[PDB]
Paper text:
[name] represents a ubiquitous class of nanocage-like proteins that are primarily involved in maintaining iron homeostasis. Each of TgFer subunits is characterized by a four-α-helix bundle containing two antiparallel helix pairs (A, B and C, D) and a fifth short E-helix that forms an angle of approx. 60° with respect to the four-helical bundle.
In TgFer + Cu, the ferroxidase binding site appeared to be occupied by one Cu2+ ion (90% occupancy) because no peaks corresponding to an Fe2+ ion were identified at this site, based on an anomalous difference Fourier map. In the TgFer + Cu structure, two Cu2+ ions are found in the 3-fold channel. The Cu2+ ion (Cu-2) is located practically outside the channel bridged with three water molecules, and the intermetallic distance Cu-2–Cu-3 in the sites is 3.74 ± 0.23 Å. The occupancies for Cu-2 and Cu-3 in these sites have been estimated to 80 and 90%. The metal ions at these sites were confirmed as being Cu2+ ions by an anomalous difference electron density map. Cu2+ ions have been demonstrated to display special coordination properties, such as the ability of Cu2+ ion to coordinate strongly with the imidazole nitrogens, and Cu2+ ion has been characterized as an inhibitor of the catalyzed reactions between Fe2+ ion and dioxygen in [name]. Thus, these results lead us to propose that copper binding to the ferroxidase site can potentially block iron binding to inhibit the ferroxidase activity in TgFer.
Residue numbers in the entry:
A (entry chain B), D (entry chain B): 3 to 170
B (entry chain A), C (entry chain A): 2 to 170
Write the structure that this text describes.
Amino acid sequence: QTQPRQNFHVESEAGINKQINMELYASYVYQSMYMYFDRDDVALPSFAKYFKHNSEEEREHAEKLMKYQNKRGGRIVLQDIQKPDLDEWGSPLEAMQTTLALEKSVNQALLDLHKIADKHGDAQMMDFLEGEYLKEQVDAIEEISDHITNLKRVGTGLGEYMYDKETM
Amino acid sequence: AQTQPRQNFHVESEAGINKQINMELYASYVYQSMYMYFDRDDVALPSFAKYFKHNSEEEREHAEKLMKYQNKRGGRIVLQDIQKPDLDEWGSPLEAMQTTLALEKSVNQALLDLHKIADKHGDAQMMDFLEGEYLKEQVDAIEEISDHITNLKRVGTGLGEYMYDKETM
Amino acid sequence: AQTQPRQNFHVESEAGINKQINMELYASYVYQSMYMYFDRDDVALPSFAKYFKHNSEEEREHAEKLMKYQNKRGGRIVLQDIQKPDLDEWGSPLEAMQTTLALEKSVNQALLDLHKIADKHGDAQMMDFLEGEYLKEQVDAIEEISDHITNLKRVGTGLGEYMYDKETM
Amino acid sequence: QTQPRQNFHVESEAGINKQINMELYASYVYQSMYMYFDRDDVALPSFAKYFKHNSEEEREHAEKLMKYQNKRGGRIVLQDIQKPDLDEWGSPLEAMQTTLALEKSVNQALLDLHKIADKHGDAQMMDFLEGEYLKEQVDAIEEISDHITNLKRVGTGLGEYMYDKETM
Ligand SMILES: [Cu+2]
Ligand SMILES: [Cu+2]
Ligand SMILES: [Cu+2]
Ligand SMILES: [Cu+2]
Ligand SMILES: [Cu+2]
Ligand SMILES: [Cu+2]
Ligand SMILES: [Cu+2]
Ligand SMILES: [Cu+2]
Ligand code: NA
Ligand code: NA
Ligand code: NA
Ligand code: NA
Ligand code: NA
Ligand code: NA
Ligand code: NA
Ligand code: NA
Ligand code: NA
Ligand code: NA
Ligand code: NA
Ligand code: NA
Ligand code: NA
Ligand code: NA
Ligand code: NA
Ligand code: NA
Ligand code: NA
Ligand code: NA
Ligand code: NA
Ligand code: NA
Ligand code: NA
Ligand code: NA
Ligand code: NA
Ligand code: NA
Ligand code: NA
Ligand code: NA
Ligand code: NA
Ligand code: NA
Ligand code: NA
Ligand code: NA
Ligand code: NA
Ligand code: NA
Ligand code: NA
Ligand code: NA
């Protein structure tokens, strides 16, 4: 056993490794969206900036899970980061709808990881996940939902441009 | 049997103040409902939300100032149920402002009727308190909501609703 | 038919939050009644008044934070009548604090029952939100009111009530 | 007619002169109370300070009515300022009860003066009285009422001394 290890099940350790890969994947998706809105034929720099920031924070979320794995005495096992499903992401509205589905899948995987901690009595891991991950996912899902509603309200064309200049 | 401060303060004015207190609290509740309606994920107009949040707190403060006045004159505060608002959801920004205009006018008419009670009982100090602290602000509020309605008709639905939120609200 | 944010959020938790919202608003109304009772000319304890004024605004803010949470998770806020408090007047500072202790404990028990609803439906995020944002403060509030009751029994009526107002309150 | 005079009835002018005398009288009463609490055998310096301030403000209330009389074109006619009814004022509680009755009589006389302005259509005088006199009398009567309630609560002896040090 590694020196720190106490009340830390191998199933939780494996679940953290798989969550690490999913955060890195989400980071890659947002990096793709960032560079898509930076295209000369899309050219929405504040949408670009938004996905750049989201890409950096998903990757920080990954690192915080990596730090946690080491803190509890787990061992980090990295896997390929899959490329995103698409090369281009359509309208600002479609990109946000794609983002909502992504954040919800990440949230479901965090809830499943919390279930692993719960069944093995890992009280500290449950609280770590609730405070550091579940709370932010709820805020992020709300924020993307508001974006989708406003993008439907303002419509295509001028409205997409104004939303970029104002909210984003 | 009169309270220590009481002078030139009729029981009908005291009762009228208690009724006005409930109506300010009711209006506060209406605005707090509108605040949270515009905070919904499928409405999501954060500056309309903040406007009704502020309106809800001013109405609650208007209620408290009436409560303080009741005590100052030697009246006794008698609280009643605060009815829930008529609707759970308030439609478009335009419809919500139209609902607000009718509410503020209803509150104004009840303030004017309360002023009439003070007047017929010779309560000079209460008339002036109402004029300076309530009637003046109701006239400003009714004007402001009217301007909002006109601009919301001008900008129309969709992008205009969003721009009004970012600019005026 | 689900709202955009909704995930792992049961209708029973949503209903429980709406019920807790009404109970926080009710407690706010109770404290606002106590605030204005201590502001009466024949009670006239201005620091007890300010204490319940602040308590009334925190309860109203606790209600709003629950309303915001309901929207965040994709629930729909359904408001109900805010019942008037049981009494119009609250007796001595000691009796008012004893009334407050029972109220805060009632609110705490309803928060614990709301936590049980989240727990049985596996709502990990809602349990933590309740623990950090509501249960922790209810425990601090219940302790603080208990200290007030003990000191009010120690100082007794008359001068002691006045000194407690000037010093601790 | 004096140069400024417009819509200013002789009955209002006379009523202001009589209100002037009543404010000066109230000022004299409070000056007596001030010096009574300054006695070596009473010795409550914050009660003394309170009645000193009230004496100064009654006399400022008198001067503001004198200024108003001149503003409207009335002529100030002064009368004897009667000495107060008593030379000594008993307990802090009794002095406050005496003060409440005094402020209420002054308030009733202001309301009667407002009636004179009303029946002669003197809109400006009514508003002057409401804003500058009636509002303050209501605040003063409330404040004295609170004092009486607290003086009954704290009782005689130590309570009188503590009230002097704390509220007064
Ligand atoms: Cu993440
Ligand atoms: Cu837990
Ligand atoms: Cu926890
Ligand atoms: Cu109002
Ligand atoms: Cu609470
Ligand atoms: Cu005066
Ligand atoms: Cu008038
Ligand atoms: Cu006026
Ligand atoms: Na296992
Ligand atoms: Na597993
Ligand atoms: Na690209
Ligand atoms: Na760019
Ligand atoms: Na590795
Ligand atoms: Na959609
Ligand atoms: Na769980
Ligand atoms: Na959020
Ligand atoms: Na947003
Ligand atoms: Na919107
Ligand atoms: Na009547
Ligand atoms: Na009536
Ligand atoms: Na709502
Ligand atoms: Na509702
Ligand atoms: Na409602
Ligand atoms: Na209209
Ligand atoms: Na009305
Ligand atoms: Na159920
Ligand atoms: Na239930
Ligand atoms: Na009261
Ligand atoms: Na009541
Ligand atoms: Na009550
Ligand atoms: Na007890
Ligand atoms: Na309960
Ligand atoms: Na005459
Ligand atoms: Na006369
Ligand atoms: Na003397
Ligand atoms: Na002295
Ligand atoms: Na003279
Ligand atoms: Na008395
Ligand atoms: Na009059
Ligand atoms: Na006052
Ligand atoms: Na006082
Ligand atoms: Na008192």
